[PDB]
Every structure is written in structure tokens, then in C-alpha cells.
Design a protein around this ligand. Sequence first.
Ligand SMILES: [Fe+3]
Ligand SMILES: [Fe+3]
Ligand SMILES: [Fe+3]
Lengths: 389, 389, 389
Amino acid sequence: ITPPDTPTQAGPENIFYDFNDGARVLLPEGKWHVRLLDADSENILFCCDVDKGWVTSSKKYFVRFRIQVFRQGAATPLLDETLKLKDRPVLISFPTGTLGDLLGWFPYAERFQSLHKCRLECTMSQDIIDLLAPQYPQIQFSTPDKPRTVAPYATYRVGLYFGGDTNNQPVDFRKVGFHRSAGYILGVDPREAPVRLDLSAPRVIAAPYVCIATQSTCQAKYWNNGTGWSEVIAHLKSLGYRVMCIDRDAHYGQGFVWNHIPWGAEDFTGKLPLQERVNLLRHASFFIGLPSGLSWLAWATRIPVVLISGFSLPNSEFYTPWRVFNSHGCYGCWDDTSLNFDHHDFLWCPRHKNTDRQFECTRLITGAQVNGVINKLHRSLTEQGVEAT
Amino acid sequence: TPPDTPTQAGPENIFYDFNDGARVLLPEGKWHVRLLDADSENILFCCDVDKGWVTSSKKYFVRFRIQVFRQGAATPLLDETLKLKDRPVLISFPTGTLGDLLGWFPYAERFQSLHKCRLECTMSQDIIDLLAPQYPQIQFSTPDKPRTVAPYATYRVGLYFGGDTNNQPVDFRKVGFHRSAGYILGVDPREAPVRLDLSAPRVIAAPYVCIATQSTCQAKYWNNGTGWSEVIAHLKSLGYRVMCIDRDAHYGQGFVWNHIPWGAEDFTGKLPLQERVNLLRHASFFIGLPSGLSWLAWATRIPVVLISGFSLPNSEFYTPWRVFNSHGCYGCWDDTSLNFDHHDFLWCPRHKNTDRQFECTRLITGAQVNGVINKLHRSLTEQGVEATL
Amino acid sequence: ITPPDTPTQAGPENIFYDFNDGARVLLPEGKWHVRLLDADSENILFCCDVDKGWVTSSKKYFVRFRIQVFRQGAATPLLDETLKLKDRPVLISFPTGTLGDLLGWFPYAERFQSLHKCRLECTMSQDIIDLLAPQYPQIQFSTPDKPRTVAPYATYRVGLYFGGDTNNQPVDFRKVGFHRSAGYILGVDPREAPVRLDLSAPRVIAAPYVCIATQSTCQAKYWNNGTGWSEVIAHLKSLGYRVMCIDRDAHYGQGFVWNHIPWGAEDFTGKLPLQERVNLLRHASFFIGLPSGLSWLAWATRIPVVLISGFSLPNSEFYTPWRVFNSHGCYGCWDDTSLNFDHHDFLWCPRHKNTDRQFECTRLITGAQVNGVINKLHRSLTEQGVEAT
Ligand SMILES: [Fe+3]
Ligand SMILES: [Fe+3]
Ligand SMILES: [Fe+3]
């Protein structure tokens, strides 16, 4: 996933400059004074004297950089080029991060291209490509190992950067929301939007039904209330809905802590292509889930989404009137800039790990609370149209 | 200031309330009290009190359920659940600045439409004159002359510092100072402009732009030496007349004073806000700071160029013309590890009394602002007023 | 700044002596006894036995020195030379200091020449040369880098010496006044006088007008009263005067502290030749300024000068009945021998930096105070003239 070993642009004096991984310039032997500017503000971002080697901007997100190379003590610069992306090869590289990450990030990539009118290629796992590519003919999708461009003018690496990093992102993603961070990185309208999907599939299950997602990547994201899911599933049926579980896994966990597809839900679990999930989701009356990926997919299918989460604040994901949250105990571990997410600890709870208050984030969210929300949504579905937002 | 005695009204002598945030007062002799959240059915607080006031630690909106038990009895004496329909409710704002109130107010209207209550709001006369005509369903008064006298519930909308989570559900710095009001009242947290009287006819014939350069602390000022002057000169070169509409022409502390910029026309002074609304309405656009006039300008439906470095772009209302620089210190105001000082006009927690003081806004050059002005100007001439907003 | 590397006058046995940088004698290879005397008092200033190398007076200001060199055992001296400046090449070197410095010092250089009847060359920036040279045909003007007399008999470097230095100046300039110090250095009548200017230019602006200078070299010299300038400018107009600001810069400052041409003053700013400023000043009814340079120029064009200053005492600059000063708080940072001016700190206030009281020097000088003195000046002008003394 590395940038070219040598910058892709030819400077007048055997000098190569690049905007892959930020503004780069490789100097041949000589005497130089190099300047990086922000073209929009005219500010001098960085400035130094060197003989040969590398000069790279500390900022890696989108900046309209302007590179200037001077012979020490000269009046005009030998090289003076400003980033201009129109009709030029650009690479946006996503990591093979979770599903929710990409569905959140991706629209911002399309915005970047409409704005700059560049030749854009994006890199991600094949399964997302199969899901999205047809709806974005403007953009070329590839895999990290076989990108078509080979030599690009500019590259941007959209992802999450922890520990408050402000070199790869303009603002800490925790301040703006993990998905909106993509917009800031790329310098586009940061307002959230759903991906475009193939919503042409015809209805298969005739009766009214609801989809649910109970599994996630860490325990904190689970709804850790003892009887929550069982109370919800029972209630959904008492309203006349069939209930299907569409989690990738039927059992998931670590050590002795294991989570299983709830008794009473239908087994639509399994790892299959996302398009099949889209097709099933499309005709669901609504969806109940966690802040992991499937909720973003449900969102993009244009159906109501009941989102249950205590470890993140309501503004941490896309807006839904059906968001569930409880503010009486610990909440928002995830958005707190004084704490640090541990990728390796599935049982991560910064403030209460190994105490009887562990995962209070979600234990305070009762089935009654979730059913209350479901009742309002149900009334709105009967009494008002589906169209009623 | 809640009533000295709860305004209910419970069948036995003791009176219960929701004015501070609930409240029960019990005559001498033992009882056991239970506070619940009707939505989740969780027991929030539980105790035995022989005498005195028992009140919830949470003061923001919750569907409280008060239960009073005789010791060791199985059934409760009192079991009242908050129901606001057709009842006197008081929303008390502080006499804070303009921007605060304009930002918060729409949430109070939402609270009313949701609960169908009899709502009275308390605020400075100044704002009442501006808003009252457009919110006929709500009663407006001043803090010293409230008409309700006896209210069923009271809610105190404001900013609470130091990470307080008793008067607000979530630290306002995590959600935005204005959106906090929606969380306190428990309604749709999405920002909206207030409704104004936009009937006034055009007075100044030629195209013009309004600007606001003053603010409440030095950090909210545009501390770039030549910023304003470069902008004002540029505006004129595009054919715009420029008017300054700040309440004061000179404002500051100690030796630090800010003045209406040379070259701007003098429309300053403490006028009724409606006159500012009338002038603003026909301005091609507005340039200001995260202070109050920007919120007024917003609500008059004209494009707003908003310059701010101490505040992240997300925090105020959205505008595609937000100016922000991410290369140095930024966001003093949103940072939960720091603390705003009301008494220090020269507040800069990270760089006070150093070379970098107010870097927040010194990095924002006139060129940067003129770049944004140029795009907005282009969009106004190319497209219409429709197509921008 | 540099004196010849070898003294310009030849003594008998290969000794070179001169007075360029104090009294100097370069001795080659012998056992010598050297005495420096003050011919006026006959005092032996310095006395020593030296084998080879340099012997210079510690005193560098004007002294009628008498150099005597002895063989170690000798009854009488082989060098008996005593300073005599008649018809001899003398160099007076000014630093490239501010305008007020030079205009204050210069008259004393002319006095030194009238007194001693020598051939005098002066070194200073070109812009001052253009202003003065025509009125001082007796004196030869040059710039520091291109001096015409490469072998001078005596040299004197007029300037400010800090830290109570008494080797380059007879007495601390803070005790006698920065401008008068020049006369002490040169040993002439120390009484202040204005420079001779070309006052022949004809009137251009017909109506009555006042010139003002609001900018300066450090913040302490600004009139840091919040509403001062604005109140003065408004008042001048109500008296029928047009007001022009003639500062070199329209904006000046450092960090976040910036000063701008006051709203309401006509813009006559910019880096123009001083002769254009003299021509404009000449016909002004009067001038209002700070202890910086333009006030000295105003003075010399023979118009009444209102001088506002708190960081220096009234006697610190030239006499004017229109000097404005406030004695109730901190004043006179500048004249205080126990403090030290900081050339590198634009926000220097030794007593009160970084406190509420910073620049109390001039916050105590209100617009009312200045308008009071303007009123008196105005009455005297309408009634008596011009001639006003
Ligand atoms: Fe937690
Ligand atoms: Fe700051
Ligand atoms: Fe002082």
C-alpha cells in the first residue's frame, strides 16, 4: 500500500515531486532551499535548507500544497508547482477495515471526484467492490495488491487515526465522528450520506418482517442487557413481524464470553455476498442493530434503523430518530479523547473493566426502553406512510 | 428559581414537582422513595428518608416516575408519572448572548410541538421583541416577571462547564453548544434557524455585504493583522458596499482594543435586533465570527462566511463558507481537557502570553478568506440565490 | 561602524595615533609608558606601561585628549600630540535608528562644526540625507557603507547607549533626554533645537486640516486608550478640521496585537519620501502624535504639536505647551534608570507586563484629556495665531 519509491513528476533539474502520502520532493545533489506552501492561505507551512534527499510535508491529508525549490540565495524558484488535480491520476486508499467504516467513508470519495474532476481510483476488499462499483461508474475500483494506476499524481489514505493524531487527519475523528472524518481528510462537504446500492431486487418474503444484527467486533458494542434481545424479539412477534437475524456469525466471542444468535430469531446468519443482505434488507419493515457495519447497510437500503449503542454518543453515527441511548451511567467510552481504544482487547472497558459496572454502557438500556422506541416507530409505520421519512 | 413548595398536589399533604427536575416533599414520619425512568423502567434513585426533600440528581428532561412507599408496604401511596400534556411548563434561558439564544430556541418550540404543553419561556426583552410574533403558541416573559407563578415542570437550558452531566445529559462540547439544548429537552437534536419577520422591503439599492468584527473574548476575534482590511478592499473591488453592524464600534479589555475597521461603513450601535434583521435580509452575504450576529444572519436566509479558529467547523451551524485552518492550534473551545475562563478576555489555554497566542486565527489570512469569498461570489453570479442555499 | 584598523596619524618612531574611536595609540615593539590627559583639566586620565599593541581611552565621547608616549626611563615624551580639530577630517556616525532619533540629534552635529571649524562628514540612511543635505551645505553626507573620507582624524558615534553605559556617553541619556545626549557626547550646548527644513512648498489642501500619527515602534508608545483616537478625531471634525493620518504603515504590530489607521481619518499613509510629509505638514493647523519620529518632523515644520506620551516623562522630548501626560498611575518606564528597555519585546512594560495594569501609561490618558488640550490650542489659534509659542 506504499507510495512509489520515487516521485512520479519530473522537475526541471533532475528533480522529482509527488503528492502521494503528502507533498514530497526528492532532491539530486546540490544546494537547496525548499518551501511548502498552502496555496489557499499562502502560508509557509515548512521551510528548510538541504543538499539532497527527501523533503516531505508533515500533513498527509488534502492540502492544496505548493512546492518551491530554490538554489540557496536565489531570487526566483527553479521549481514552483501547485497541486492541480483536474484530469490527473488520483489514488484514494481505504484499509481493509470493517464494513461500517467503508460504507461511512466512501461517499466522501465520490464528492472528492465531483469537486476536482480528477481520474480517481479506489482500493478496498473485493466484497465491497462487488457491492458498490456498479453504482459508481465514474470511479475505478481495485484491490490494494493490483491497483491499475501504478504511477499516480496524488494519493490519500482514508482511515482512523488514534491517539489524537493530527498529521493524517486534520481533526481527531472522535471530535467529528469516525465516518465524517473522511470528509475532513479529503476537504469536502463533511455532511454524512448513505452509499448508493442496487435496490432493484423484488420482494421474496411476503409477510411483514424485521431484520436484526446482534454480533459485533468488541464486547462493548454488544447490547449487554441480560434480557434485552429476548424481550425485543418476543415483542416484535406480538406486533406481527417475523424476525430474522442476519449476522455474519451465529456465535462470536473470546475466552469464556460468547454471544449467540438469540433463541426465537430466524437463522439468516452466515458469510455471504453483501448484495444478498441488501436484497433481504430492502423489504424489511425496519432494522434493529448495533454501531457496527450492518446498520450502515440497513441505512443505505432506505429503511428505518433502530440503533442501540451506549459506548458511543448519538452523534457518533448517522442520524436516526430511532437511536437508543441511556444517559444515566457510563456512556461514550468511544468518543472520549482522554481514553484510548484497544484493538487487541475484546473485553475493553476503560472506565469499568473487571468491576461489577463493566458494560453499564448497555445494561442500563432495557428491553422496555427499546420496545418503547419500537412502538413509536410502529405507530408511525401504520398511521403515517413509509415515505414519512 | 423553583417554588419553595412543590406545586403538586399529591393527595396526602406532601407535594411533588418537576420544576428543578422533579422533587418530593414529605411531612414527618418515615417513608421510602423510588425515582424511576418510565421509558426504561430503571430505578434511578432509591432511599429511606424520615424528613426533608428528596430530588433527582438529573435536572434535564426525563420521563420521571415518582413512587412514595410507606415503610415495608408492598403497594405505593404515590405513583405519579410525568405527563406534560396541557400543563404549565417553564423553559428558563439565561440572559446569555444572542448566539446562545438563537441557537437554543428552536428546540423549545420542538419540545412544545412534541408534548403539547402550555409553554412559557423566560429571556431578555431584547429577544422577545425579535421572536414572539413568530411563535404565537408560546408565552414569552422576562426572568423577573414570570406569568406562570406555578409551573408543573421547569427546564433550565444553558451551558454547563467542567464536564457537568447533571444539568445536561452530555457535555455540550461533545455535541455543539446549540445542539445541547435539544439533548437537555430530549428532542430531535438537529440544528435549525429561528423564524423571523422577513417582510421588510429593500432600502439600499446596490449590492452590499454585512460584517461583524466584534465579539465577547479576544479568541473569537480574527486576530490576523491585515485580514479585515484585505477582505474589505476585495469586496469593494467586486462591487460590494461594506457595512459593519456590530453593537459596539470599539470593544476590549486592558490594552487590547478592537475597532470598526477603516473602510467599512458605520452601521454600529445598540439597535433593536429587528433593524439588523431588515438590513441583513437584502445583503448579498454576511461575514462574521462565531458570535451572535452570525446566527441572526443565518436565520435571515443569506449565505454566511463564518471565520473561526478557536472552534471546530462542526460546532456551529453548517455553512459551505466556513473558514478554518488546521495547521496549528485550533479548537480551544471544543476541547474537553481544557476549561473556558469567563473572567479572562485574553483566554488562550494553550498559548497565552507566548509568540503563538491566538495562532487559532492568525493563520487565517485575508487570502484564505478572499478565496472563499471568490467561490461564493462566483456561485452568486453563476447560479441563483436558490442554488447556493 | 568600524574605525581604521591602523591609526591614521603617524607619530615619530613608527607610532600611529588617532582620535576616531576615542584616543588611540598603536605601539610597536619597545618598552613604553603612555599617558592620556584631558588638555582642558590637565588631569591624567589613564597611565600605563605597555610593551606592544593597543592603548585606547575607555572614554569614547568628545574629550580634548592629549596623548603622551614615553621611553620607560625618559624624562620627556617623544609624542606630545594634543587634539586640535580645526580644518581636520571628522566623522560623526549615526546608527540607522528611527527618525525621531536622528532629527533630535542632528542639530548638535552642526553645532560641533560651528564650534571647532572642522571638515565634517556624517553617515546615515539615504532617506534622511535627502531631507537634510540641501539645508546643511557645510556638511558632507554619506551612507554607512560608502563613506568618502577613509582616513579621518577624529570620529564620534552618536547614539543611545543602554544599561547606564558611561564610556560612550558622558552621562546616562535617561537623565538628560535621549536627544540632548548627542550634545553631551559632542560636548556642545546641550539645548534642544529643531532641524532646518525646506519649507518652501506651496499649499495644496485649501481647507483647515490636522495631521495625526498613530503608529509607533513598540506598543508602549501607542495611545492605548480604547476610545481615545476615535473621540479626538470626531472632535476635530466638529471643530471644522479635516484629519489625515500620515503614518508609514496602515497596520502595524506583532503576534495578536495590531494597530490600524483609525476609522474616520483620511488615508495618507505609506512609505513616501519625508519631504512629501514636510510639505503636507507645513500647512496643517496642527499635529497630534506620539513620541516617535513624525512628531520631531512636525516640530521642525514650525506647527503646534500635541504630543501624547505616558511611558516617557514630559521633559524626555522637545518642549511643547501641548504635551499630554498623566501622573496618577505607572508612567515613565522609559526614563527610569533602574529598568532596561528591551529591543526585542514589542509588548515591553517592565512594571506591569501581563497584568491588568499593562500600559496604564496611556489608558489613563482619555480622549477628554486630549480634547481639553486641543480646545486650548484651538482657542489660541483662532484668537492669537500663529504666532503661537
Ligand atoms: Fe464503558
Ligand atoms: Fe488558541
Ligand atoms: Fe508601563
